[PDB]
Amino acid sequence: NGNIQVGPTGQLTIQGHPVIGEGGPITVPEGSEITIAADGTISALNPGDPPNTVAPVGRLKLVKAEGNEVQRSDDGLFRLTAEAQAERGAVLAADPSIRI
């Protein structure tokens, strides 16, 4: 689900229980005007500033894992099958090839 949302305090939350990218939870400035780049980099703009002030504020981590190594976990959230963990570890790598 990519229906991302921003809370009033600047917290980027695919439906609450928020998102993870390059660190802990992703947090963005309150005056959002957020855009998500092709490979995930999250850039922001205060609505009342010149457009040449859009430096990136975060990164949206993306993961490659498919089918036999992914398992539903009683929520809308999947995890690793406990068989793809004597493998690529508990917290997966960012796979710099997944596009948005």
Partner: protein, 260 residues
């Protein structure tokens, strides 16, 4: 309804304003001192969909993002304050203006307006009034017996009496200049009023302080270039044609959407 229909609405309304201005110019040929008007247009909001900044990769830049944009809101109507052409009225009372300046006039409310129309008269009291009875400023009361009226290029108006063979000056007729003539708010009657875009009115004798000269026996014609108007009017008809075709295309699209 559909984003295209509002945009085409704006196009039609703007072209209609063009036709309105053109028709007002066209009708006021043979209006002395009339000044051409021309509409200045302006695009409306641009709905930003992707920011033209908004870095696309970790290195790239996304040049020229998406923005749609609507509207052609007409923003202003400039008035061309160039020197119109003169014409021989052979009327002792009609005066044209050589260059900048305006005639000040006192309205019935006591406020003052400004006119570039030399079609003057004299009422039953001997005051110069302008085709509508508006008593000009400064007051000029022609004596009852006066035979001849003359108005010099410097504006000193002087009458000739019976027997008394000395052209005794009877008054001084001076002009008023604004440092932005375009900003005056016309109120009909060939009369403009002061607004806080025009600037304070500076009164001066003709010829001095940049004001124009006075030409008695002439009237200044409207500076309407008729050929420009005809070609502009062809342009406006074809632009309205195009925008109507846009409305029709949107209508047909919305048809086969409903029929779906």
């Amino acid at each position: 309804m559909i984003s295209s229909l509002w945009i085409a609405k704006t196009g039609l309304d703007a072209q209609q304003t063009n036709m309105d201005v053109i028709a007002n110019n066209l009708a006021n040929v043979s209006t002395n001192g009339f000044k051409r008007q021309r509409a200045v247009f302006e695009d409306l909001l641009y709905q930003t969909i992707r920011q033209p900044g908004a870095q696309s990769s970790e290195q790239t830049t996304l040049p020229s993002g998406l923005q749609i944009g609507t509207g052609v809101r007409p923003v202003a109507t400039e008035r061309l304050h160039s020197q119109g052409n003169l014409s021989q009225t052979n009327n002792s009372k009609d005066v044209a203006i050589k260059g900048q300046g305006f005639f000040q006039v006192m309205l019935p409310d006591g406020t003052s307006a400004y006119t570039r129309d030399g079609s003057f008269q004299v009422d039953q009291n001997g005051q110069l009034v302008t085709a509508g009875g508006f008593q000009v400023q400064p007051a000029i009361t022609i004596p009852a017996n006066a035979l001849s009226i003359t108005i010099g290029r410097d504006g000193v108006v002087s009458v000739t009496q019976q027997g008394q063979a000395a052209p005794v000056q009877v008054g001084q007729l001076n002009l008023t200049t604004f440092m932005n003539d375009t900003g005056l708010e016309s109120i009909g009657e060939n009369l403009y009023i002061e607004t806080q875009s025009s600037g304070a009115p500076n009164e001066s004798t003709p010829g001095l302080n940049g004001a124009g000269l006075l030409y008695q026996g002439y009237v200044e014609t409207s500076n309407v270039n008729v050929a420009e108007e005809l070609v502009n009017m062809i342009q406006v008809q074809r632009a309205y044609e195009i925008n109507s075709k846009a409305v029709s295309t949107t209508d047909q699209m919305l048809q086969k959407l409903t029929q779906l």
